[PDB]
Write a protein that binds this ligand. Sequence first.
Ligand SMILES: CC#CCn1c(N2CCC[C@@H](N)C2)nc2c1c(=O)n(Cc1nc(C)c3ccccc3n1)c(=O)n2C
Ligand SMILES: CC#CCn1c(N2CCC[C@@H](N)C2)nc2c1c(=O)n(Cc1nc(C)c3ccccc3n1)c(=O)n2C
Ligand SMILES: CC(=O)N[C@@H]1[C@@H](O)[C@H](O)[C@@H](CO)O[C@@H]1O
Ligand SMILES: CC(=O)N[C@@H]1[C@@H](O)[C@H](O)[C@@H](CO)O[C@@H]1O
Ligand SMILES: CC(=O)N[C@@H]1[C@@H](O)[C@H](O)[C@@H](CO)O[C@@H]1O
Ligand SMILES: CC(=O)N[C@@H]1[C@@H](O)[C@H](O)[C@@H](CO)O[C@@H]1O
Ligand SMILES: CC(=O)N[C@@H]1[C@@H](O)[C@H](O)[C@@H](CO)O[C@@H]1O
Ligand SMILES: CC(=O)N[C@@H]1[C@@H](O)[C@H](O)[C@@H](CO)O[C@H]1O
Ligand SMILES: CC(=O)N[C@@H]1[C@@H](O)[C@H](O)[C@@H](CO)O[C@H]1O
Ligand SMILES: CC(=O)N[C@@H]1[C@@H](O)[C@H](O)[C@@H](CO)O[C@H]1O
Lengths: 728, 728
Amino acid sequence: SRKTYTLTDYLKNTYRLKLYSLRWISDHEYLYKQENNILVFNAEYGNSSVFLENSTFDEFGHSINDYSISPDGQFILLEYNYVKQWRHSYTASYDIYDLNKRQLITEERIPNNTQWVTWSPVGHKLAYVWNNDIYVKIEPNLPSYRITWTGKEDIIYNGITDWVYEEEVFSAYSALWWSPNGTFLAYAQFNDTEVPLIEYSFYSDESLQYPKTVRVPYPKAGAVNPTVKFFVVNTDSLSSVTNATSIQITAPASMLIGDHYLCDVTWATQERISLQWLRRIQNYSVMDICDYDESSGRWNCLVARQHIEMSTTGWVGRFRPSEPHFTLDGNSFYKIISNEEGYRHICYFQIDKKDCTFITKGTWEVIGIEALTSDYLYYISNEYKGMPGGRNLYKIQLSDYTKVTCLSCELNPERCQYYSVSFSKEAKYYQLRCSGPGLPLYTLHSSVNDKGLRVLEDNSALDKMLQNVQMPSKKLDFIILNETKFWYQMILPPHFDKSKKYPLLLDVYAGPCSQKADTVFRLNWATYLASTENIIVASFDGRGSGYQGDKIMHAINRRLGTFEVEDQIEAARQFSKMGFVDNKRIAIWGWSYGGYVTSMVLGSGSGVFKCGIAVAPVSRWEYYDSVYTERYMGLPTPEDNLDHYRNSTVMSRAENFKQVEYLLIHGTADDNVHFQQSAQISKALVDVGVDFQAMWYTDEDHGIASSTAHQHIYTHMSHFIKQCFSLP
Amino acid sequence: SRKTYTLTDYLKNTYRLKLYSLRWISDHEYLYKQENNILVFNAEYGNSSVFLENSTFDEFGHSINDYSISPDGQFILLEYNYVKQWRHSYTASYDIYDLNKRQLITEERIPNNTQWVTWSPVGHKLAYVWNNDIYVKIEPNLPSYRITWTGKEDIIYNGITDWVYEEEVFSAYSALWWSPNGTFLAYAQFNDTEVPLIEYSFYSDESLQYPKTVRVPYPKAGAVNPTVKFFVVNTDSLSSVTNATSIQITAPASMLIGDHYLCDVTWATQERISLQWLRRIQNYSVMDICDYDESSGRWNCLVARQHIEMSTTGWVGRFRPSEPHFTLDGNSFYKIISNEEGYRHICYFQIDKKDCTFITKGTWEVIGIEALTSDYLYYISNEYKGMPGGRNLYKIQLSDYTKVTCLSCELNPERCQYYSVSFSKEAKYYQLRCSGPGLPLYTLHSSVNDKGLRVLEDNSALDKMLQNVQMPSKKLDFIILNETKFWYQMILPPHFDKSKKYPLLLDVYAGPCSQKADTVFRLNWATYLASTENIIVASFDGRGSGYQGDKIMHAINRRLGTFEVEDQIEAARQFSKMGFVDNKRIAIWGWSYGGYVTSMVLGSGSGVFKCGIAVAPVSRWEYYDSVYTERYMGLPTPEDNLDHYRNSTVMSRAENFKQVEYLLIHGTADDNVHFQQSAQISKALVDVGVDFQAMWYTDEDHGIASSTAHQHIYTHMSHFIKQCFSLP
Ligand SMILES: CC#CCn1c(N2CCC[C@@H](N)C2)nc2c1c(=O)n(Cc1nc(C)c3ccccc3n1)c(=O)n2C
Ligand SMILES: CC#CCn1c(N2CCC[C@@H](N)C2)nc2c1c(=O)n(Cc1nc(C)c3ccccc3n1)c(=O)n2C
Ligand SMILES: CC(=O)N[C@@H]1[C@@H](O)[C@H](O)[C@@H](CO)O[C@@H]1O
Ligand SMILES: CC(=O)N[C@@H]1[C@@H](O)[C@H](O)[C@@H](CO)O[C@@H]1O
Ligand SMILES: CC(=O)N[C@@H]1[C@@H](O)[C@H](O)[C@@H](CO)O[C@@H]1O
Ligand SMILES: CC(=O)N[C@@H]1[C@@H](O)[C@H](O)[C@@H](CO)O[C@@H]1O
Ligand SMILES: CC(=O)N[C@@H]1[C@@H](O)[C@H](O)[C@@H](CO)O[C@@H]1O
Ligand SMILES: CC(=O)N[C@@H]1[C@@H](O)[C@H](O)[C@@H](CO)O[C@H]1O
Ligand SMILES: CC(=O)N[C@@H]1[C@@H](O)[C@H](O)[C@@H](CO)O[C@H]1O
Ligand SMILES: CC(=O)N[C@@H]1[C@@H](O)[C@H](O)[C@@H](CO)O[C@H]1O
């Protein structure tokens, strides 16, 4: 008498997973948004006060997109007129509000089309980027000072990132870094002057007679890369009519000898900045420590003080070198590094000393350092029960490394196995977030004795609702390949009778350091295909996948479209042997990297698959960007790796496609994985006479996330899979 | 016969239609190529000697694309390195082979990347366009003379046409007109400085890292149009010292008050040129007869002797004011004109007297004037048996307008009802071309007494092959809606059964002055569909169609997307009725304007069609070019016809597509009907939640004519129709 999780349920969000997003405002309080009524919470006791009622601003004029309360609590930034650009960048209008005197500042307003704004870490200063130039406000109503004058669209970028850096380096549009004092303002400067431009047509509304051409500086594999510079401005010494003075911090000599990237920026203390540069050949990286010398007023980055981090098996770090976590005094820090056994662990570094010291060890990996105090270091790893797809919060007694405590392992063994944490400043408190295998559960904790303070959100409203639906179950196990464990998850149709034959959809990503087999709970497309269409949706992490050691993650070094492709097929094969999967009805599909892999598999000729769907997939590595691509493929030169670049295109496998049913999808406005890529694929198929299904999405980009487009693609895809499996 | 007409037959061109292309070189001889040999034939006796052997350019080095023998047969232009551009335009290299010797004039060679070349009507003079500038060579081995210096890519076009003129006006890349004498050289100049550019991505070869953006000056409905000037130069007076002086011939003052175009250029005599201008509001045109003043070296067009063409019911001409045929002395001429009752007949004009004299009348139309001797005017009409879809050659005795003879009606009644003709210069002979309903037949005739000299090609071979195959038959009938008769055709399956029920596909064009129903014989996709899949393929010429009077053709005036659409739906209702049509399986498909009509049809919610295929369809008239669009819709402004531009989009009907299975196809490199038009359609469907099938073709243009692309699309469409009609 129960219904099934239908496509519409997923498409129309019938079952809402609740969340609990707070922002620590101090060591003991946090802000939380409830019914548009911003509240302030006391962590210790749980009581609160409304900080700003929805009521306020009902006569503002425009819709408010986001809020940002200054560290002071005296002002609050009002963001509206939000126009999205890339994955993290966007532009918007801003207004400030004096809380001391319920008023909107009308004088010296932040300009329109501002690219980025940030309060200082303490107080109420402001720094913004308008027209690629950095401006600073000491007071909200006072006129701002101009820090840089070189800014110029699509060429010079100050305080903000260009395309690659936003996407592949900082996962952010910002390139501004305030000191903990608020005294200094460090910023990067990008220069795309010689960076080729990818161009594509944006059609826009019907009303538009002539389509428009978007031109973005985008460096494809091997092209000229943007260059970078770094500066630091003293915010307290800014006069009315006196251009501000930025002191540039050069990169190490080992980086300047060639192309290089700025990878990280971290303030150690009030007068010490940490910088990490990486070579274009992401083999070698160097952390730089620069101190402020009150004398000249310059910044020295002592050469002896440097720290090298290279790799012989592959690239450095998971996607970039790891971030350092300094001890309060700043003379030491902690950083996650690949050890001699190839596993990632916490290393302790002391500034004026050479080599570091590992604090953790084992056949598992530390995902990330979350908090640091004088007595403990808090991190998350997948040690518990040897599950790489599990996540847990641990404690390390700094005076005895052998004393490690798991803080989330036994809170809810049956329900919780994947955790992410959020510590208050100075780590007196911490919020745990469990996202599976059961419904998400948010809890507040005391740090002094690890006491559970209270449940913040347990999704019981969703639980009630779901007890009426026939939900699919998840199996997390592994298979063996040349004496190695490789995990896979299976989303099984409710009432899974392993004495029957079920069709199987292989959901793939399989990109460098990926992980599709894990313990998190999801309400997605696969949930539907399993609940209603009774299809088994499996995902496999083979060579290349991450969080299992460098031997597995680097197996694909300098050879994408190789072992990870083969392993997807081998997993699929062994799934067949299993007495519950119709080996005549096995499909595969993937988005982006998952789409390239899906194409590679369909064009392998294994005969293992009946059909496959590839969404906005890479087809030839020369078409993707320099940073991501080169990190694994090196350069596309004859001296370097040109042969394998040319040996791993989807096009070269066109002929084998005649053995399968292929559906190709792509948004015409994809700025990330250019339409060009799918364009070249279809042409390869047309040139060898192979028939296939196609579908473009006018003006959608990599995410094809516009409500209408989103429901459309998943509807289309469902039909394709239903027909490919002869399912009603 | 057992064997049927397969798709592979159509795509691989298994049963070829022989032909007989000849080029008349004089009053009684013509060239023809056998294999790779150019033979010259004598029309009177039929004897032929070899003019040039396939063994003359083996050691040439380049693959010869075409040849061009000069008037006095002394030289032969060799065309190679042919690189296509738009529909009629292209670039190529050339070499002149002197026949009076055994050499390739290697001195003053015609520059590479030449855009257009042409001999004079007499002798061996040579004019050519290069870099948008005109050059003239009196002798093939001599240094050419530059005629214009204003040439500027995409801006100033001298001697060649811009995109709109090439496609919608002169249907050719050339804008050069030699005078009979060979003395003068009139040319046109286009100024595209203020024309907007349509831009689209061209991905090219797999090796091209960044896609290339193509920009073509192209005016859409209501956009700024290219301007034009006319010139005439005396090529007898050309000194390599001083520059060649061009004389300009302004347009009629009644043309300069607003935008206008040049429509036709025809020389009457040695010193007389005929220029027809058209107002940007295509229902008013003025022909200009200009005479060369030998004393002032000028050209004067007495404003007194201008002729006016006007349309109250629509626009002028079928697609433009028809072409004049001057009597040898230049004092008069015949021109096809819509008479009082609205049918197009031959009119006789005497240069300095008002009005013209209709020398034909009837409820049928003159399709074209082909020749004009001192005693007879030859032309082709569809008078015979009141069949608009039939064509025949007629002769009118100039000294007694009532005496008209039919030169092809009775040649072979049951096999030939659609002729086209080619007269030898002076017209002593004429080659008649029979296109159907039977296999093509080519014959040579003498006009002295219209004696049939001989058969040139009768397709005996193709004929004997088809008897062995089970071919479909064609029915050319008509239905009556109100009180008017509208014709249609039907390609019926082999062994047709009036008691059996076959599915039906509606092949559609339906544009203004189109004719899909006729007596022509064709071997196409429709043949495959009826022969092998037993699908009835019917076409229908409803309102708007041509060759039947302005009552039917102008019905559509300023109202595209209405009657022509209704009439197609209607036709299908009637065919449904006919007891041999399964009203459960009726499909519709069209390309270009047919793509458009097919979409409107599918979006009307009529409930008649189950599925349909649209290829490179127009979606909204504001996206197509000005000259063709404005010709039927006027300007898209509020004071003009903007209301109907906005009420005739494929988009506004989106919702209705939920009731039909739709397949949308388009070449991404389409310069004619910009990919944009389909991109907006898909977005509308997606925005409204309608699932359809899609398919783009990277780098293909309006014709999707590359060998591989062409095969891929007709296969793709075949699977679609086969699956839409539950066909085994
Ligand atoms: C090309 C390429 C690529 C590589 N890639 C990256 N990075 C590392 C960080 C920076 C980025 N530049 C490159 N992140 C990824 C992927 C990826 O393929 N998929 C599969 C996937 N799966 C699904 C279901 C997706 C759905 C929508 C959009 C993308 C999707 N992608 C991912 O999920 N994530 C999170
Ligand atoms: C947009 C538009 C348009 C209108 N149009 C024109 N003209 C008039 C003269 C000037 C020109 N600019 C516009 N000629 C046409 C069409 C047309 O739609 N189809 C259907 C069709 N059908 C098939 C099967 C086709 C196949 C390939 C290419 C085109 C095709 N077209 C035609 O066959 N012909 C010959
Ligand atoms: C967020 C909040 O309301 N905190 C209040 C605090 O201001 C007050 O001093 C205390 C005693 O009543 O109760 C809570 O802790
Ligand atoms: C600081 C500033 O630029 N203010 C103007 C505002 O006065 C105007 O109403 C708006 C138009 O949307 O453009 C800006 O926001
Ligand atoms: C602000 C800045 O440093 N601009 C430089 C520019 O002067 C130089 O000519 C160019 C050459 O690549 O590189 C950068 O764009
Ligand atoms: C050769 C020629 O006619 N050039 C004209 C130029 O004189 C004029 O200023 C412009 C205005 O659109 O159009 C063209 O560029
Ligand atoms: C012989 C002579 O005067 N030649 C000139 C040429 O140099 C100049 O570039 C052109 C444009 O004004 O006009 C003439 O063709
Ligand atoms: C528009 C809006 O947010 N309204 C909410 C209302 O639903 C809620 O019941 C109330 C309780 O404080 O708070 C208001 O802000
Ligand atoms: C085209 C051709 O070859 N015509 C020749 C002609 O030159 C010659 O005068 C005649 C008499 O022998 O024989 C014909 O065959
Ligand atoms: C008349 C002339 O310029 N001919 C040259 C030809 O010799 C050369 O082979 C070709 C490209 O290699 O370019 C042509 O323009």
